[PDB]
Amino acid sequence: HVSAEQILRDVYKKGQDILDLEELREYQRRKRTEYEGYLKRNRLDMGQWIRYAQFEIE
RNA sequence: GUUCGCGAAGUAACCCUUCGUGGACAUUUGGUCAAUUUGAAACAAUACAGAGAUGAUCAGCAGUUCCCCUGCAUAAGGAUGAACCGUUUUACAAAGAGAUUU
């Protein structure tokens, strides 16, 4: 009962707040540095532009 | 200051000197810049780790960059020079069926 589906199923099974305004400013700094880093290296993933703009809508 | 012209004194002196006068020669530099912190160099000092493929040990060459450094450099080197991996929802429909409000 050592069939390959059991091994691959178990290797799938093995693989698994804001308070103040300046804290939200640091949150926006961290998140905009993240998304401008992943838009500076790749300017052609349009989903990334979409979700960073939708972040700044949020 | 030098020279040219004139006058006045020494001085009833064409020698010389002094004083006064008009002219000419000569005509607008340097600073983007102030002498220790407070208009910005970076390394080094501490401490810890100690390299990209994966089971280990590695040669690399590349690409993107709103990262540069050493290099005379368009060569070459810098860990393959470094960051790359991270999140991840709508150009969004059409057909068919039943359960609901009127």
UniProtKB/Swiss-Prot annotation:
It comes from the Eukaryota. HAT repeats lie at residues 26-58. Disulfide bonds: none annotated. It is found in: Nucleus. Belongs to the crooked-neck family. Involved in pre-mRNA splicing and cell cycle progression. Required for the spliceosome assembly by promoting the functional integration of the U4/U6.U5 tri-snRNP particle into the U1-, U2-dependent pre-spliceosome. Also recruits PRP19 to the spliceosome, as a component of the NTC complex (or PRP19-associated complex). The association of the NTC complex to the spliceosome mediates conformational rearrangement or stabilizes the structure of the spliceosome after U4 snRNA dissociation, which leads to spliceosome maturation. This is Pre-mRNA-splicing factor CLF1. It comes from Saccharomyces cerevisiae (strain ATCC 204508 / S288c) (Baker's yeast). The lineage of its organism: Eukaryota, Fungi, Dikarya, Ascomycota, Saccharomycotina.
